[PDB]
Amino acid sequence: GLMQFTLPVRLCKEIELFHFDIGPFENMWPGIFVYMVHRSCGTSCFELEKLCRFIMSVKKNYRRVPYHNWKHAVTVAHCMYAILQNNHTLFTDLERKGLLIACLCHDLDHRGFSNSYLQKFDHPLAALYSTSTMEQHHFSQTVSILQLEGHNIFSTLSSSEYEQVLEIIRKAIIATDLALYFGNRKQLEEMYQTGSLNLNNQSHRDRVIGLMMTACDLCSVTKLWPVTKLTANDIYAEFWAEGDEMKKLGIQPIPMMDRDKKDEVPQGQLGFYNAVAIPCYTTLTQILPPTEPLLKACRDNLSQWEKVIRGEE
Numbered sequence: 536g537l538m539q540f541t542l543p544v545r546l547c548k549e550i551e552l553f554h555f556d557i558g559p560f561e562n563m564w565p566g567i568f569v570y571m572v573h574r575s576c577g578t579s580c581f582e583l584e585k586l587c588r589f590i591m592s593v594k595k596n597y598r599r600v601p602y603h604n605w606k607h608a609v610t611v612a613h614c615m616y617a618i619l620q621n622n623h624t625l626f627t628d629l630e631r632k633g634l635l636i637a638c639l640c641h642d643l644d645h646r647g648f649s650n651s652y653l654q655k656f657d658h659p660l661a662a663l664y665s666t667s668t669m670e671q672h673h674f675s676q677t678v679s680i681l682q683l684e685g686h687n688i689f690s691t692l693s694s695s696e697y698e699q700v701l702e703i704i705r706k707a708i709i710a711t712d713l714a715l716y717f718g719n720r721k722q723l724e725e726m727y728q729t730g731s732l733n734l735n736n737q738s739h740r741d742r743v744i745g746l747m748m749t750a751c752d753l754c755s756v757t758k759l760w761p762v763t764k765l766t767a768n769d770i771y772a773e774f775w776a777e778g779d780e781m782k783k784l785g786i787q788p789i790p791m792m793d794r795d796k797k798d799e800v801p802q803g804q805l806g807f808y809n810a811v812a813i814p815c816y817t818t819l820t821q822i823l824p825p826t827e828p829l830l831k832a833c834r835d836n837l838s839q840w841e842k843v844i845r846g847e848e
């Protein structure tokens with residue numbers, strides 16, 4: 536084990552920045568993930584042949600959708616790598632192992648439709664899982680892939696460690712259900728402003744990981760303006776396809792899903808940054824101060840959407 540993963544000089548420097556873009560070459564994203572696992576966790580965390588097989592099976596179970604795709608999985612994992620590297624003392628061995636995997640797997644088999652669409656559509660998954668429908672499916676896909684021959688990347692753990700890391704992965708994946716994030720964030724806010732927040736308490740760790748998962752999931756709003764602006768076209772391409780499908784069920788979609796309301800997108804982004812993204816990163820900065828650059832870049836993007844609304848660009 537004296538073959539080590541390296542990146543070209545510009546990726547080696549810029550991968551440490553919260554606002555790194557992983558680029559348009561798909562065939563380099565497996566290498567970037569392994570590199571992040573090797574520096575984040577260690578070169579000994581995983582057997583390379585099992586990890587490589589796991590990564591390729593995960594890639595094959597993401598779909599060709601505009602936003603919730605393979606590129607989003609790796610991007611979310613990289614934001615988690617940055618949080619882990621800038622808070623290295625706060626996490627256990629199992630948390631480092633589970634969290635990069637949770638992030639790579641968190642939207643497995645996404646079709647670009649919300650839990651709401653699956654309910655209104657009466658999709659079979661909505662019968663199997665009444666709440667966090669898609670997020671329960673993604674976890675179930677993660678478990679199927681882990682049960683494929685040659686894919687048990689946790690084979691060096693004891694039974695009880697394996698079980699714990701799969702419980703970290705399950706809870707991290709359920710927490711990417713944005714309907715759960717409002718509650719979780721309000722609870723961490725109270726806990727922080729009263730001084731009861733305690734990282735030796737497992738239920739509090741769970742809440743902090745939950746919040747890290749939302750931060751990583753939304754991290755597209757924390758890139759430099761030209762990345763953030765281009766990735767918004769991709770999320771809206773999904774939203775408008777879901778609103779089309781709502782219209783096909785005879786249901787008026789919510790405004791952000793109506794492609795006839797395309798001109799109100801800038802006002803939509805403000806609403807989202809003020810109600811969801813800014814509070815999300817403010818709280819995360821309060822709990823993990825070295826994540827400040829996520830909040831900063833999010834503020835800068837909010838500032839850019841305000842410039843668009845006043846016709847300055």
Ligand SMILES: O=C(Nc1ccnn1-c1ccccn1)c1nc(C2CC2)ccc1Nc1cncnc1
Nearest residue numbers: 713753755756763766767770791803804806807811
């Ligand atoms: O824009 C987003 N949502 C949204 C638009 C209007 N209202 N609104 C909203 C309000 C309340 C609740 C939920 N969504 C958005 N949503 C999400 C996850 C699906 C929720 C992830 C990223 C997103 N944006 C984005 C922007 N720039 C670059 N990449 C991504």
Ligand SMILES: [Cl-]
Nearest residue numbers: 600647773776
């Ligand atoms: Cl879609």
Ligand SMILES: [Mg+2]
Nearest residue numbers: 641642711712
């Ligand atoms: Mg999701």
Ligand SMILES: [Zn+2]
Nearest residue numbers: 607641642752
């Ligand atoms: Zn996601």
